[PDB]
Amino acid sequence: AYRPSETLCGGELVDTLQFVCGDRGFYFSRPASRVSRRSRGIVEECCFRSCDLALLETYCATPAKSE
Numbered sequence: 001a002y003r004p005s006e007t008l009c010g011g012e013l014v015d016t017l018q019f020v021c022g023d024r025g026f027y028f029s030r031p032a033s034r035v036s037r038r039s040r041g042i043v044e045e046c047c048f049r050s051c052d053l054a055l056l057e058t059y060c061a062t063p064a065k066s067e
Helices: 014-020 044-048 054-059
Strands: none
16 A cells, blocks of 8 residues: 655654564664765655655665564
8 A cells, every 4th residue: 555655854754664664673874885985864865855665665674673
């Protein structure tokens, strides 16, 4: 189900990852990536850019302290 495309900001966009990351939790602060420099991080993108969704999908954290 979910929604179409939207934009949500700091705290509010936590809900995006909250729905796509899921049972593991997301990290927000992605480390480096494969572009030899840094990469995007939360809020500047759903708050300042757009919520590309796939983003939030990848913001999730499987190797997280399970509960």
